[PDB]
Structure formats: structure tokens, C-alpha cells
């Protein structure tokens, strides 16, 4: 009598890409948040719009904000950087042509 729903759209999980919020334990579609799919692994911690507004998170004092990782400086790559290193791996660690 009604499958489980998620996100601000309150539609079911039909297989598309989603993030889990860290304030509440809900899940949100990338397309509903207007976040490009290629930024799939560039999110460190996500907080839905209703948790950043203090409506459904867990604080009470400050409000949680979505933190983004540092993307590999190769314009093609959309993988997160390593520690200190400005590249996602050694296979991309070349800064200059010579």
C-alpha cells in the first residue's frame, strides 16, 4: 500500500544515484538537489536543505553545512585529491609538460 520513499520529492529508490544526509538518516537524489552526477565522489559530508535550516537535523549551537572534497587538479579527473597531494593518485601526478 505504498513503497518507501526518500528525498524532498518523496519518491521511492528506483535505482538512481543518491546521497545520505548526515543530520537525519534520509536519502536524496542528485537530480533533485541539482548537483551534477560527475561530482559523485567529491562530497565529504552532505547535509540536506532541511538539516542546514535546523528543521530536522540534530542540533539543539551552529547549523551543519555540506562539505566538499578537493578535486584532482587534472581538468579531466573528477576524483578527490589524496592527503597533501593535489592529485587523486600517482597515475595523475604530473604538473608540467616537461
Amino acid at each position: 500500500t505504498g513503497e518507501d520513499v526518500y528525498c524532498i520529492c518523496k519518491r521511492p529508490d528506483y535505482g538512481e544515484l543518491m546521497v545520505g544526509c548526515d543530520g537525519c538518516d534520509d536519502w536524496f537524489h542528485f537530480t533533485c538537489l541539482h548537483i551534477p552526477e560527475q561530482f559523485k565522489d567529491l562530497v565529504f559530508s552532505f547535509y540536506c536543505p532541511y538539516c542546514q535550516a535546523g528543521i530536522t537535523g540534530k542540533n539543539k549551537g551552529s547549523l551543519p553545512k555540506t562539505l566538499w572534497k578537493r578535486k584532482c587538479r587534472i581538468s579531466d579527473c573528477y576524483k578527490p585529491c589524496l592527503q597533501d597531494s593535489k592529485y587523486c593518485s600517482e597515475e595523475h601526478g604530473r604538473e608540467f609538460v616537461n
Binding site: D13, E16, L17, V19, V43
Partner: peptide, 7 residues
Amino acid sequence: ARTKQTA
């Protein structure tokens, strides 16, 4: 973060 794609 925590992501999920069943496809």
C-alpha cells in the same frame, strides 16, 4: 560521503 546507486 555516503552515496548509493543501485544500477
